Symmetry: C2
Subunit: 247 residues, 2 copies
């Protein structure tokens, strides 16, 4: 969803001061920007300081759709910041509830839960490990065989981020039975899915010998070879990289 900044915004003239030659104007504008950024982070931190996270995690068990969905947006949002903010989400016990919400008959709830997991798995290796431990992988994989393309795309993005951890985190993806589904996804009519399936296999390929062979066993060499000649240009530029590192 795109927005317009309000008409009374001071930001444009503030940006002009930064680019100016005056150096009183330069100093004034950097101070105002530092204030805006400090204020914005502090409002986010105050919510965490307030003890909101564990109470929001509780509300993930709400029978009410409205409440569960808003509490889910809030957590996803926090988990989209730095590592420290993901840690707070994890510490509040979000993961088991987030993993459980992958069984939700609601397609809107499933997608928001998948986006939350992606955010958390975009952090450090031990935080991706936490996700793995919570048993996210068995559900993520079965969700790769989904008729719903929009769900598939987010489940795929969540695996890629897990697949961008250490070798042991990558191996957990392999052990979960992810490759057959990923390789099949290189036959996707939808181009955007192909590219994320590509980037997922590319992230796995950044592992050691064991991870590479597993990808060769799944039949990914054959595909990337006779895929390096697809209609699109950047789908060839990324399949060339996904084939070259497997060396």
């Amino acid at each position: 969803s795109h927005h317009h900044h309000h008409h009374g915004s001071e930001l444009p003239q503030m940006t002009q001061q930064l680019n100016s030659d005056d150096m009183q104007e330069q100093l004034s504008a950097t101070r105002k920007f530092s204030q805006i950024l400090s204020d914005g982070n502090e409002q986010i931190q105050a919510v965490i300081d307030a003890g909101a996270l564990p109470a929001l995690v509780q509300l993930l068990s709400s029978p009410n759709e409205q409440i569960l969905q808003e509490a889910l947006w809030a957590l996803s949002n926090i988990a989209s910041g730095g590592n420290e903010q993901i840690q707070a989400v994890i510490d509040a016990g979000a993961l088991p509830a987030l993993v459980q919400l992958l069984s939700s008959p609601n397609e809107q709830i499933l997608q928001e839960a998948l986006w939350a997991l992606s955010n958390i798995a975009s952090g450090g290796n031990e935080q991706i490990q936490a996700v793995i431990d919570a048993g996210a992988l068995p559900a993520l994989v079965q969700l790769l065989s989904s008729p719903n393309e929009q769900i598939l795309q987010e489940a795929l993005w969540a695996l890629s981020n897990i697949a961008s951890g250490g070798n042991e985190q990558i191996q957990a993806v392999i052990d979960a039975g992810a490759l057959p589904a990923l390789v099949q996804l290189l036959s996707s009519p939808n181009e955007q899915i192909l590219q994320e399936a590509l980037w997922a296999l590319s992230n796995i390929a950044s592992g050691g010998n064991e991870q590479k062979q597993a990808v060769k066993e799944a039949g990914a060499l054959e595909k990337l070879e006779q895929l390096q000649s697809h209609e699109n240009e950047k789908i060839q530029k990324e399949a060339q990289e996904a084939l070259e590192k497997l060396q």
Copy 2:
């Protein structure tokens, strides 16, 4: 540390989350979401308004306050998620931050290192951008700073870089960081050697090629000697890393 103002609505909202009343639960979640949406849109408005490239340009300012103030703003943005980190790199920050790494002024150097740490706490391509910008040669050279505040920030940065994939871990090894990392185990500072242990354990998360390089540096010798330490918490981390070589 700071206090929130007495008029803050947050405590009554938190209690509304934990209540049995669904209406109060729903009013509180919507309000928390609103607050979070607002803060994140304040930060994005600064980016959408084209500030970053201009702040990067002010990293080469002859004025002490300006340079310092711009570096904090850049550092602050880089402490968010990957999307915000990328905007900083796109703005051209890394070259300027690396050049600032060899500046007379001590606090400027420290903030420069803090900034680079923030950037290296993102994804692998982001950490690789730090490496391609030439950060490592300077970083290792700072591992024996007579200033210990500067030593601990430089350590943090290397841990972050070494917390990437195998390609970035090998780069740290290739830059000759292991000997100095090992020598920081037998050092008086209990907070520093802990960060050096964090650092070494992160390398030990790589492959065999990475695991063996640490061994040739004399890690296993000084890792086992750390079970005779006064502190109980160091005794755990030394083991969690010593055994991390299965």
